[PDB]
Swiss-Prot record:
Core component of nucleosome. Nucleosomes wrap and compact DNA into chromatin, limiting DNA accessibility to the cellular machineries which require DNA as a template. Histones thereby play a central role in transcription regulation, DNA repair, DNA replication and chromosomal stability. DNA accessibility is regulated via a complex set of post-translational modifications of histones, also called histone code, and nucleosome remodeling. It comes from Caenorhabditis elegans. Monoubiquitination of Lys-88 gives a specific tag for epigenetic transcriptional activation and is also prerequisite for histone H3 'Lys-4' and 'Lys-79' methylation. It is found in: Nucleus; Chromosome. GO terms for cellular component: chromatin; nucleosome; nucleus. Keywords: Chromosome, DNA-binding, Glycoprotein, Isopeptide bond, Nucleosome core, Nucleus, Ubl conjugation. Its main location: nucleus. The gene is his-11. This is Histone H2B 1. It comes from the Eukaryota. Belongs to the histone H2B family.
Amino acid sequence: RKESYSVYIYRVLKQVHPDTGVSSKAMSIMNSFVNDVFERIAAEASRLAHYNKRSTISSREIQTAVRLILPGELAKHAVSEGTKAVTKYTGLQFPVGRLHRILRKGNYAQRVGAGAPVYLAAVLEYLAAEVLELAGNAARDNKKTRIAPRHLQLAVRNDEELNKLL
């Protein structure tokens, strides 16, 4: 019932920790985490568009959705990433073409603009890179060569903003 971002979650880590791997138990936890984040933002952006008497979800509704979900300085960076990405593409490790397709199925009565998945791909790529950086740090501190769910929940634990995001 969930999408598969394991390819792009892995492509992000080789940019964050090139000589580090990830367990498959830790891979599905990241994949489900990215899924819980996508749907929450897509649900808010849809309500925001229906709230403001609109019907095409744009990068504007994606940002305000992100600002209304990610706490503190997580929303500060994710907004910087989404805005920077949208202007550059009217690179990114997430499939903008696939994320656009997923956004449309949320409700076919609401159109989806081209700039919305560009913003969402950057935010998802940022939230992935931040978790794998802290989880990758906890693994190299233990001299281990790949990330386990132990280092995942450890990364979320000592990060209050990440822990508030669940």
